[PDB]
Amino acid sequence: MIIYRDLISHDEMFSDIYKIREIADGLCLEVEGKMVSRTEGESTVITGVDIVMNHHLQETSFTKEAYKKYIKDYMKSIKGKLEEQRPERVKPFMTGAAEQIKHILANFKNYQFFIGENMNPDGMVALLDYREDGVTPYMIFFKDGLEMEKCLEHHHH
Amino acid sequence: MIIYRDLISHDEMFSDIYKIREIADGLCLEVEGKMVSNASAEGPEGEGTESTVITGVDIVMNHHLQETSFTKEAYKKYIKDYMKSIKGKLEEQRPERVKPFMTGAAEQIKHILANFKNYQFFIGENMNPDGMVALLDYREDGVTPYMIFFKDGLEMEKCLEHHH
């Protein structure tokens, strides 16, 4: 098991129980979800994306203007982290993110927006969209905004 | 995140992303799962519509649990040996638990056998014949899946969060 945590907010975002692939020349991780149904007490049936339910992701929303403002600031926060920790990623992050912002805005209506449980305005905003079948959910995260935590092997002395 | 692992086989069985409760005086854990699954219709002239039952359970898919099956005779033999293996581990590691484990498991075995046809049977990814067999059943609502594990047959392992 590997946990993927938001570098800024420290929220758990997802784990490797889902299919994960790199897209956008290594800038983003695309995490394929499943639609699932849980029940709450007579029972009520509640359907949604597994990734969102399992990791307590919170739906949020934005105007385009507010998203443009937010995403510019988010890039600057990640640039600063990369400068300290991984200076080799700075250039591909900044050019890659510049390209992606234009495309996210061009397709703004197609997305739903999710943040970590803490709902930190500085944290990552994951994007939810659906495959060509219109039914299989997938979520997009910025790889440079995530920290990987392996669940380590545990032994007795 | 906390991982629950089979004490014998070392397989990951589940994690604390599910609703979990203890039952039978702390002998077992019940882990609640989630169901995983053109408007044309033929009407009376055709056949009835297909069943809407949802047969998928997320716990199984997420932790690579493997369905297995048993005759009632083979399950009796297996579960008796499984208790002996657990008693052993408790003797080595938690001697206090032996007595309530053996009475509690004796009761549980009779309950399971009485309700044998109600279960599906799942083991960890390694498919070790000495490992735990988790039992899948459905709540009284008819539709919510849950899985039963022997708590004494599990090890809890935290995924330790990093210092940031």
UniProtKB/Swiss-Prot annotation, chain A:
Subcellular location: Cytoplasm
Signals that turn on the gene: Down-regulated in response to enterovirus 71 (EV71) infection.
GO terms for MF: calcium ion binding; DNA-binding transcription factor binding; RNA binding
Tissue: Found in several healthy and tumoral cells including erythrocytes, hepatocytes, macrophages, platelets, keratinocytes, erythroleukemia cells, gliomas, melanomas, hepatoblastomas, and lymphomas. It cannot be detected in kidney and renal cell carcinoma (RCC). Expressed in placenta and prostate.
Domain of life: Eukaryota
Keyword annotations: Calcium, Cytoplasm, Phosphoprotein
Annotated TCTP domain residues: 1-151
Keyword Calcium: yes
One GO term describing the cellular component: cytosol
Annotated GO biological process: calcium ion transport; intracellular calcium ion homeostasis; negative regulation of apoptotic process; negative regulation of ectoderm development; negative regulation of intrinsic apoptotic signaling pathway in response to DNA damage; regulation of apoptotic process; response to virus; stem cell population maintenance
Modified positions (Phosphoserine) in chain numbering: S43
InterPro entries: Mss4-like_sf, Mss4/transl-control_tumour, TCTP, Translation_control_tumour_CS, Translational_control_tumour_p
Self-association and partners: Homodimer. Interacts with STEAP3. Interacts with TSC22D1; interaction results in the destabilization of TSC22D1 protein.
Family: Belongs to the TCTP family.
Name this polypeptide is given: Translationally-controlled tumor protein
Organism in which the protein naturally occurs: Homo sapiens
Curated annotation (Swiss-Prot), chain B:
Record's subcellular location: Cytoplasm
Broad class of where this protein is predominantly found: cytoplasm
Cross-referenced InterPro entries: Mss4-like_sf, Mss4/transl-control_tumour, TCTP, Translation_control_tumour_CS, Translational_control_tumour_p
GO molecular function, one term: calcium ion binding
Region (Required for reduction of TSC22D1 protein stability): 57-159
Phosphoserine: modified positions: S40, S51
A cellular component term, taken from the record's GO annotations: extracellular space
Pfam entry (one): TCTP
Record family assignment: Belongs to the TCTP family.
Name of the protein described by the UniProt record: Translationally-controlled tumor protein
Taxonomic source organism: Homo sapiens
Organism lineage: Eukaryota, Metazoa, Chordata, Craniata, Vertebrata
Gene this protein is translated from: TPT1
